[PDB]
Design a protein around this ligand. Structure first.
Ligand SMILES: Nc1ncnc2c1ncn2[C@@H]1O[C@H](COP(=O)(O)OP(=O)(O)OP(=O)(O)O)[C@@H](O)[C@H]1O
Ligand SMILES: Nc1ncnc2c1ncn2[C@@H]1O[C@H](COP(=O)(O)OP(=O)(O)OP(=O)(O)O)[C@@H](O)[C@H]1O
Ligand SMILES: Nc1ncnc2c1ncn2[C@@H]1O[C@H](COP(=O)(O)OP(=O)(O)O)[C@@H](O)[C@H]1O
Ligand SMILES: Nc1ncnc2c1ncn2[C@@H]1O[C@H](COP(=O)(O)OP(=O)(O)O)[C@@H](O)[C@H]1O
Ligand SMILES: [Mg+2]
Ligand SMILES: [Mg+2]
Ligand SMILES: [Mg+2]
Lengths: 238, 391, 140, 248, 397, 232, 239
């Protein structure tokens, strides 16, 4: 009889599981597929748009956003949940650029965001905060003093450094494909080609310019989201 | 406003004035049309029903009279307890269907060794003496039984049950095809296994596949079959099935939808007969029992006792790799393109039972037929899974 | 307060055809047997002389109708509806007066408490002063 | 089911507690008001006058709020009193802050916001009170607004709320000539509506509660019809009904 | 096996204005009806054909005797004796006489028995107890796919399920998919389920067996499953055939542990129906169609994908379907030119096909109330609320 | 109906408060009609034996068809056709089977002809939606409690046989009955007659009618004033 | 079960209270807004007042600031509350930054308000969807839809409320680049979309047009008859 423990996050299963947190985890699969890959030359983030109507403004739907010029993001889950998460992340990065006047590392970015996360069952919510686990899985990538770095965040608050992680509806299959398609010496161009290959194999529709949002972060330049022409260039090869 | 009832003049004027000039002949003609249909129906006749009369020169009408005047009919009955006969109480209580029950003594043409409880026996009218035992006979055309010696489904046609099929391998392949290992390990081979899981999971199909690959004939025992009309003598029916399994080199006895039997007077007689044919029958035999139900707990507690049912096996819903594998195995028999992203379909149908996936493939074929295309596209599969899945 | 006793006295002091039933007696095991018995008792009263049907504890079956969600409640309300249609239905009864007694009149169905079915709803209050004297005198 | 605290949403989207707060007004006393060419009035039913109520009051169903604001109440007595007191507080807070009598629409919206806040959040039962504010403002002259326990409102020239409100408002809209009634014809119409909607062959002036709002000489006067006045009006309507039936 | 049934007469309705084109067409129909009547009358007027065998037939009848009781051959023994159960239910070990066609004896076939000393003396292949005979459609309903407005997807699905396999089925095994054995119609009441069943039974080429669902239940023990078995045996015997079980929720409700004998018999009847539905191959040309309003209350084993794959949804008609239905049901009317009909369709309501038909009928009645038959727009305006009896205003605005 | 092009109406439901003229109207219709009127008042179709209710429904409709254009009066249709209950276990199903058979007979595959049917109930709101459906039940006639003129008419009908006195004003008596059903009006007539009988007279006076109105209409109010004053 | 709790994830990962509040909009009324080259239009179905309602106070279309407008679908009390809060926030934003509030800012504020109202128990979500329209400082036409889930999205022409799917498909089939060339073409499109669901025409439709900082005037019920005369004229013109 699980039913007595799913009601509420502050319950413990006979197997010691957090059923509310597990449901939040599974709620990630409701979101669109997001794939990020880490290479020596940088990190690239590929996502699916899942456009509901051609009359939609594609700029509104945001699967990848900028927390700071040196770092990038990817989302899978509730739009508003991730909106609060990203706003907090940007506020935190400016907090660091205020306190230490430096660019704060991506591992610390996911540290602070996970600090905002996993706070659902915390008494400090008296002013007002999450009474429910945050329902978005986060993909953080960028370049810091340790070179290019990509971190995947779990709505439970867990983070892990991942060379190539896939979140969203097709996380299992995309991860399985990335398992054999990834090599350590992969160049940025061939990595992005492989990422769009995985998206093509995974996405429910054909790949056009309005089906993919593409992002890149390299030590040289700042965060660049691929424009329409850059997206066409990177998709015409595939 | 007080609305006036239409007067007789008003009825008369409504019937005319605002009428087509052909109302009269049209209505009259249609009335005669219906009348003529009724006349044709009433006088067309019925035609002779053709009773079962054999072609001439086949009839022995003289000997027919001889039999009708000499040979006598016998009522048939479900014989019961022998009253502990010992040749001084040859009477048995016998049940003539919905008629009463009678204690009756044998005819001189029969011997008590040929009569035991539970069998159908022909009894005379005058004294109700059992005149001849009538075995219920065994025939694949009657009942619904094994009707299979080498099922056409192999391990290829079953997918998404890898741990499931591996446990089944442990259950059946190791004792049947490698008896020496349990001989020199001094361990009794598994005596009974229950394959419990939700409907449409593949229990029946996995059992049939393992039957094909175990070089043993598959047995199909539908429960509602012997809950319905073929009840009662079903004990002797399964008795004969098990006996032929003894004669057969190896049978894979699986009782389909045992939810219908495990959940009881003749039902209890039956499962105690299997008590005699697993407990009484040696546990070493090659006719191992296979149990599969939609309701696991429904099976009587005396059945799964240690020394009757060694294992219990859970058939869960197929996973992502399982769902894509069943999609492939079901679309192999279908006209589709060679670039169907089956992984996409498996992803799009979460927590979907195997029957739902086969119905999805069927609906994809239906959508392909709808557009009168000989080859189904990925689009057809997408709309089919939009239709079946999500209900 | 004297309800069943007044029914008893009426049964004694009558030339009429008295049929005594209790409410709980109507509710039968088998489906459709309760309404059948209501039909039978009223039919027996009709085919006899000027008759009296006394149904004690009518709140057993004549509780206010509601949205029955079970077979049993539906059957009880079916018994009540058969009672209504027998008392003041399509084919009327002649010289069949029905006496019905209950402890809780307010829980009775309003369709049963209308003139033409229960023309007179007679209240049997607790004795008042003089009534107490009369009861004491007639019992002592 | 979804009949728990008001902060719930039925799968079809209905707010069942708010729905019940709606239908609960059908148990309240019947009160109406209509908009005349040069006057506005509130007519209400005194449902509970058994024998021994002191009638130590100026009006029960009608509650005055301000030199320009008056309303009629229909709901639970406790929520009625709370709503009236909050109405007074908000109206006079606006007067103190702005040195102008509060516009009827603004005060109505203030009450509606409070009522919504009482069903929007907090796990508190919504005010089960439906109001009929009557008043004047220089922006739109004479205005009448019909409140709602749900927190909505509407500007109406004819509206009845309470028991038997549906039939009353249906016949009222059947017999409303907009823009061409004075105070006298409006009084006659209200009395006829009460005749048709109350459970009495001859309604007594005691059961009737009428207050009229009228602007004259640069000032708005709110007066409840005195017993002599209300009895004269009801007797006039009674002989008018007699005239109608004798002509019929 | 023999062939299908349900002969119907001609659609006519090529005109419908009684412009004498209807008259020539009905005149042709009636004239040919007269031709059939005269031909068969004159045939039976001169048709001398009898006797021939006689004495052999006479003596086989003498052996048969009178009466001969029909029984159900439950089981066969060595080919001189068999087991036959009389209609009472008691079964006897009897002898089979020489003149019976041993090929015809098959478990289930009705066998003629001698009244005294029971013995198989003939075989009846057309027992067809009156209940199942009544359940068979003889005069096809007059409705047609032209009479159905909207439901294009529903008509399309029902034709793909119970017309396409009976007509050219080469696509089905070309694609390797089995034809859909059984379809079920569901939706709110009065949406077009029974109407679609009538329409299918009209443009059909197979035996149509209409069933009430609650008709299958019988008082006597074992009569229910026996009736279901006989009904489906007739369906196979007259293949291809369509078995329409209206109001399937009369028996298709949730299966639960039976206690009373009647509940046990109902469960047994449903189990027999389900087993029979499994019994015939989907490649077989007998299809079942069941309709119900309370789809959720059905047994989730009656609607298993291996049993009843298709599930046709009948939503309340949309605005365009409403206007199609209104065009259909006002077609016969002599509508005045002022009627727009779009105001009623506009009104956001739950008007069904039946509701539209009733609105039209009430509008005609109201026109008759004013002694007219031209039916203005005002008649529809009042009829709408006359028929439509029975969200608190400003909640959701 | 054929010339208009409309379809013939089939059923009609008489719903309203308890005692208004529903069964009275059905009785009158039976009196004034040449059709073979049929009284099948509800719960007569509920048999102990399984599946017998549907069989009786079929037999009733086949008998109505075999006869002339007929009228079936299903009085208190609230009994058998109320609402299909989910599942079995404790919920009724046999009555649901009978009701479904009735529904199919009314408007199903066969499309019965000249079998106009009347049904009555006090609770229309609980009747099954598939039974209230137009085409099976059109013209859901409401029998509201009589208004003052209707109450006067009912009084003048039921006091027709009475020995009234000169000076009786039945209009005042009708006015003394706000929202009184017709059955209550007949009961008032009866009780005034009984008041005349008690004094062993034969005339009924106005005071007799006033006291009869007081006695019949007497009903228990809310005794507790405080509970009564919850609402304004 | 999992439905009667605003902040409890279902086993399949749904906040069912949020989706029920979202569905509550579908029981409102149709409100379609289109943005043109220089204009933005708001077409809403007006409830035909029976005999006595004052249409002055039945406001379905309201302007948050002189540079933004909005139409709502859902419960009117919630819409009034969010209107008051959002216009108060527009004024406070002008207090903080002195420049006119951009449509993005006010839409983000509305979405955040709805979201903070749907993340804790004891606070029922705002069951209203609002179409935000307006021009920025550089006069770019932007239109936003806010969803009771607390999210927002940029729509070129969207419809909400009952029948919003039909209007959505209509706009998909009819929204062209040349259909917004002139103000009259945008108007023709919006009235066509409106009459798709409210076929009665004439009344029961309200329109508002915002040009490049004209402080929009709702189209008054004199040229709605004129504009519908134009619509009917063009309608009999192509057919
Ligand atoms: N799409 C339609 N076009 C025309 N007429 C329709 C349509 N749908 C329904 N009708 C009308 O509705 C009437 C009753 O419908 P029908 O008998 O098919 O009901 P149903 O939906 O099967 O409901 P139920 O089985 O619950 O009684 C039909 O006689 C027909 O005239
Ligand atoms: N309008 C009326 N005119 C005359 N007599 C009436 C009227 N209404 C009711 N009655 C009388 O009152 C009684 C009402 O009984 P009736 O069975 O006709 O009522 P009903 O409305 O069918 O009630 P029920 O809900 O119990 O079926 C009858 O005896 C009848 O004579
Ligand atoms: N693991 C599987 N591999 C292949 N087919 C499967 C599998 N599971 C289910 N199916 C499909 O499901 C259908 C019915 O399965 P079945 O064995 O009847 O289910 P149950 O286990 O309830 O008896 C079969 O046609 C089969 O194709
Ligand atoms: N008026 C009375 N005179 C004498 N005895 C009475 C009177 N009323 C009640 N009783 C006593 O009370 C009992 C009456 O019970 P009764 O009122 O019939 O029960 P119920 O009210 O449950 O029908 C009798 O046994 C009788 O002894
Ligand atoms: Mg007693
Ligand atoms: Mg139907
Ligand atoms: Mg009655």
């Amino acid at each position: 009889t699980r039913s007595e423990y799913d009601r509420g996050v502050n319950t413990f299963s006979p197997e010691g599981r957090l059923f509310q947190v597990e449901y939040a985890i599974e709620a990630i699969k409701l979101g669109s597929t997001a794939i990020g890959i880490q290479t020596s030359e940088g990190v690239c983030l590929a996502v699916e748009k899942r456009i509901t109507s051609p009359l939609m403004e594609p700029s509104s739907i945001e699967k990848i956003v900028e927390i700071d010029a040196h770092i990038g993001c990817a989302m899978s889950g509730l739009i508003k949940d991730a909106k609060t998460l990203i706003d907090k992340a940007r506020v935190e990065t400016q907090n660091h650029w205020f306190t230490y006047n430096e660019t704060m590392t991506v591992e610390s970015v996911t540290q602070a965001v996970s600090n905002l996360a996993l706070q659902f069952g915390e008494e400090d919510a008296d002013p007002g905060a999450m009474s429910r686990p945050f329902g978005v899985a986060l993909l953080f990538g960028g370049v810091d003093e340790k070179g290019p770095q990509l971190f995947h965040m779990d709505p439970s608050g867990t983070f892990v450094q991942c060379d190539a992680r896939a979140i969203g509806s097709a996380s299992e299959g995309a991860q399985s494909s990335l398992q054999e398609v990834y090599h350590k010496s992969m160049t940025l161009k061939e990595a992005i080609k492989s990422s769009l290959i995985i998206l093509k194999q995974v996405m429910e529709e054909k790949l056009n310019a309005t089906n993919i949002e593409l992002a890149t972060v390299q030590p040289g330049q700042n965060f660049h989201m691929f424009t329409k022409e850059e997206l066409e260039e990177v998709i015409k090869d595939i | 406003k007080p609305i006036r009832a239409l007067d007789e003049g008003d009825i008369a004027l409504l019937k005319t004035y605002g009428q087509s000039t052909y109302s009269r002949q049209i209505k009259q003609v249609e009335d005669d049309i219906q009348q003529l249909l009724k006349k044709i129906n009433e006088l067309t006749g019925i035609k002779e029903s053709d009773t079962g009369l054999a072609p001439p020169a086949l009839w022995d009408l003289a000997a027919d009279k001889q039999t009708l005047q000499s040979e006598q009919p016998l009522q048939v009955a479900r014989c019961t307890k022998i009253i502990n006969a010992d040749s001084e109480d040859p009477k048995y209580i016998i049940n003539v269907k919905q008629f009463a029950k009678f204690v009756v003594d044998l005819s001189d043409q029969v011997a008590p060794t040929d009569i035991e409880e539970g069998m159908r026996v022909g009894v005379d009218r005058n004294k109700y003496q059992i005149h001849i035992p009538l075995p219920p006979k065994i025939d694949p055309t009657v009942t619904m039984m094994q009707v299979e010696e080498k099922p056409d489904v192999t391990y290829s046609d079953v997918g998404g049950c890898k741990e499931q099929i591996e446990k089944l391998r442990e259950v059946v392949e190791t004792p049947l095809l490698h008896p020496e290992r349990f001989v020199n390990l001094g361990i009794e081979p598994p005596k009974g296994v229950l394959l419990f899981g939700p409907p449409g999971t593949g229990k029946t199909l996995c059992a049939r596949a393992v039957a094909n690959r175990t070089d043993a004939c598959f047995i199909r025992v539908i429960g509602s079959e012997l809950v319905q009309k073929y009840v009662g003598e079903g004990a002797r029916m399964v008795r004969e099935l098990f006996e032929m399994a003894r004669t057969k080199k190896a049978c894979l006895i699986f009782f389909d939808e045992i939810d219908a039997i495990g959940g009881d007077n003749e039902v209890q007689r039956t499962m105690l007969e299997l008590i005699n044919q697993l407990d009484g029958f040696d546990p070493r035999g090659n006719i191992k029992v296979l149990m599969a139900t939609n309701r696991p707990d429904t099976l009587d507690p005396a059945l799964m006792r240690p020394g009757r049912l060694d294992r219990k096996i859970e058939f869960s819903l197929p996973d992502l790799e399982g769902r894509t594998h069943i999609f492939k195995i079901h679309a192999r028999s279908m006209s589709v393109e060679r670039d169907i992203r089956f992984e996409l379909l498996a992803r799009l149908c979460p927590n979907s039972t195997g029957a739902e996936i086969r119905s999805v493939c069927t609906e994809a074929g239906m959508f392909a037929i709808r557009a009168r295309r000989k080859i189904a596209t990925e689009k057809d599969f997408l709309e089919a899974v939009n239709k079946v899945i999500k209900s | 307060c004297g309800k069943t006793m007044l029914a008893k006295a009426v049964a004694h002091h009558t030339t009429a055809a008295f049929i005594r039933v209790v409410g709980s007696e109507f509710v039968q095991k088998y489906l459709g047997e309760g309404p059948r018995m209501v039909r039978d008792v009223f039919r027996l009263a009709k085919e006899n002389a000027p008759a009296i049907i006394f149904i004690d504890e009518i709140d057993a079956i004549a509780t206010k109708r509601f949205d029955a969600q079970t077979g049993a409640d539906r059957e009880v309300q079916r018994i009540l509806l058969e009672l209504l249609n027998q008392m003041d239905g399509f084919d009327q009864n002649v010289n069949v007066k029905v006496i019905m007694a209950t402890n809780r009149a307010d829980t009775l169905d309003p369709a049963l408490l209308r003139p033409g079915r229960l023309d007179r709803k007679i209240e049997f209050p607790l004795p008042d002063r003089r009534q107490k004297r009369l009861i004491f005198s007639t019992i002592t | 089911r979804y009949d728990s605290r008001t902060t719930i949403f039925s799968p079809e989207g209905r707010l069942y507690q708010v729905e019940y707060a709606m239908e609960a007004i059908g148990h309240a006393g019947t009160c109406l008001g209509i908009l005349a060419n040069d006057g506005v009035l509130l007519a209400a039913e005194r449902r509970n006058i058994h024998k021994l109520l002191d009638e130590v009051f100026f009006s029960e169903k009608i509650y005055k709020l301000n030199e320009d604001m008056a309303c009629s109440v229909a709901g639970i007595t406790s929520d009625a009193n709370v709503l009236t007191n909050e109405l007074r507080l908000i109206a006079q807070r606006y007067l103190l802050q702005y040195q102008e009598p509060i516009p009827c629409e603004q005060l109505v919206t203030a009450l509606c916001d409070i009522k919504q806040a009482y069903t929007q959040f907090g796990g508190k039962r919504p005010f089960g009170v439906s109001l009929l504010y009557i008043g004047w403002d220089k922006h739109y002259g004479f205005q009448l607004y019909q409140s709602d326990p749900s927190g909505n409102y509407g500007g109406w020239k004819a509206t009845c709320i309470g028991n038997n409100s549906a039939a009353a408002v249906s016949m009222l809209k059947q017999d409303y000539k907009e823009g061409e009634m004075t105070l006298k014809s409006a009084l006659a119409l209200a009395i006829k509506v009460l005749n048709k909607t109350m459970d009495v062959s001859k309604l007594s002036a005691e059961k009737v509660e009428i207050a009229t709002l009228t602007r004259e000489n640069g000032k708005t006067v709110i007066r409840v019809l005195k017993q002599k006045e209300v009895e004269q009006l009801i007797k006039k309507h009674e002989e008018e009904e007699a005239k109608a039936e004798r002509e019929k | 096996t023999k062939g299908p049934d349900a002969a119907s007469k001609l659609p006519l309705v090529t005109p419908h204005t009684q412009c004498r084109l209807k008259l020539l067409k009905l005149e042709r129909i009636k004239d040919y009806l007269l031709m059939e009547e005269e031909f068969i009358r004159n045939q039976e007027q001169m048709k001398p054909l009898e006797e021939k065998q006689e004495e052999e037939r006479s003596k086989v009848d003498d052996l048969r005797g009178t009466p001969m009781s029909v029984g159900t051959l439950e089981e066969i023994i060595d080919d001189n004796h068999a087991i036959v159960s009389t209609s009472v239910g008691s079964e006897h070990y009897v002898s089979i006489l020489s003149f019976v066609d041993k090929d015809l004896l098959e478990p289930g076939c009705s066998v003629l028995l001698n009244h005294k000393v029971h013995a198989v003396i003939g075989v009846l292949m057309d027992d067809t107890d009156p209940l199942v005979t009544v359940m068979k459609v003889e005069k096809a309903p007059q409705e047609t796919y032209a009479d159905i407005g909207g439901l294009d997807n529903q008509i399309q699905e029902i034709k793909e399920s119970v017309e396409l396999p009976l007509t050219h089925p080469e696509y089905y095994e070309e694609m390797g998919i089995k034809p859909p054995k059984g379809v079920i119609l569901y939706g709110p009441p009065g949406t077009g389920k029974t109407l679609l069943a009538k329409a299918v039974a009209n443009q059909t080429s197979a035996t149509f067996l209409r069933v009430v669902g609650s008709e299958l239940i019988q008082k006597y023990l074992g009569d229910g499953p026996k009736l279901v078995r006989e009904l489906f045996r007739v369906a196979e015997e007259h293949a291809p055939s369509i078995v329409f079980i209206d109001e399937i929720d009369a028996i298709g409700t949730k299966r639960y542990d039976s206690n009373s004998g009647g509940e046990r018999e109902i469960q047994r009847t449903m189990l027999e129906l389900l087993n029979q539905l499994d019994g015939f191959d989907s490649r077989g040309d007998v299809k079942v169609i069941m309709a119900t309003n309370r789809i959720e209350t059905l047994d989730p084993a009656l609607i298993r994908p291996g049993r009843i794959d298709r599930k046709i949804e009948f939503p309340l008609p949309d605005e365009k379907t409403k206007k199609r239905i209104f065009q259909i049901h006002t077609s016969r009317m002599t509508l005045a030119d002022d009627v727009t009909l779009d105001d009623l369709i506009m009104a956001k309501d739950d008007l069904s096909g039946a509701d539209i038909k009733a609105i039209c009928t009430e509008a005609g009645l109201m026109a008759l109330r004013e002694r007219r038959m031209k039916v203005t727009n005002e008649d529809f305006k009042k009829s709408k609320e006359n028929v439509l009896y029975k969200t608190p205003e400003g909640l959701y605005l | 109906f054929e010339a208009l092009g409309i379809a013939q109406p089939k059923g009609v439901l008489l719903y309203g408060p308890p005692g208004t003229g529903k069964t009275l109207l059905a009785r009158a219709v039976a009196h004034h009609t040449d059709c073979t009127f049929i009284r099948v008042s509800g719960s007569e179709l509920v048999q102990k034996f399984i599946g017998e209710g549907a069989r009786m429904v079929r037999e009733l409709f086949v008998m109505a068809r075999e006869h002339a254009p007929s009228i079936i009066f299903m009085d208190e249709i609230d009994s058998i056709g109320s609402s299909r209950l989910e599942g079995g276990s404790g919920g009724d199903s046999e009555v649901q089977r009978t009701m479904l058979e009735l529904l199919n007979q009314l408007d199903g595959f066969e499309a019965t002809k000249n079998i106009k049917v009347i049904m009555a109930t006090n609770r229309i709101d609980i009747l099954d939606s598939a039974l209230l459906r137009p085409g099976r039940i059109d013209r859901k006639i409401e029998f509201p409690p009589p208004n003052e003129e209707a109450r006067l008419d009912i009084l003048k009908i039921h006091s027709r046989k009475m020995n009234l006195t000169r000076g009786i004003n039945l209009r005042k008596i009708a006015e003394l009955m706000p929202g009184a059903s017709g059955a209550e009006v007949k009961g008032v007539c009866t009780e005034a007659g009984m008041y005349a009988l008690r004094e062993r007279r034969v005339h009924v006076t106005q005071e007799d009618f006033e006291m009869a109105v007081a006695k019949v209409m007497q009903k228990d109010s809310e005794k507790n004033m405080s509970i009564k004053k919850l609402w304004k | 079960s999992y439905d009667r709790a605003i902040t409890v994830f279902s086993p399949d990962g749904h906040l069912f209270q949020v989706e029920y509040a979202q569905e509550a909009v579908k029981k409102g009324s149709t409100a379609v807004g289109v943005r043109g080259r220089d204009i933005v239009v708001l077409g809403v179905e007006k409830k035909s007042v029976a005999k006595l309602q004052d249409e002055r106070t039945v406001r379905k279309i309201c302007a948050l600031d002189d540079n933004v407008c909005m139409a709502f679908a859902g419960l009117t009390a919630d819409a009034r509350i969010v209107i008051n809060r959002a216009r108060v926030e527009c004024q406070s934003h002008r207090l903080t930054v002195e420049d006119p509030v951009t449509v993005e800012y006010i839409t983000r504020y509305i979405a955040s308000l709805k979201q903070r109202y749907t993340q804790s128990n004891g606070r029922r979500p705002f069951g209203i969807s609002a179409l935000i329209v307006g021009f920025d400082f550089d006069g770019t036409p932007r239109l936003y839809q806010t969803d009771p889930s607390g999210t927002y999205h940029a729509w070129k022409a969207n419809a909400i409320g009952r029948g919003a799917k039909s209007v959505r498909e209509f706009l998909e089939k009819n929204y062209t680049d040349e259909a917004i060339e002139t103000d009259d073409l945008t108007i023709k499109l919006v009235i066509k979309a409106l009459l798709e669901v409210v076929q009665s025409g004439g009344k029961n439709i309200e329109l508002a047009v915002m040009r490049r900082d004209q402080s929009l005037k709702i189209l008054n019920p004199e040229e709605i008859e004129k504009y519908v005369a134009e619509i009917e004229k063009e309608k009999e013109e192509n057919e």
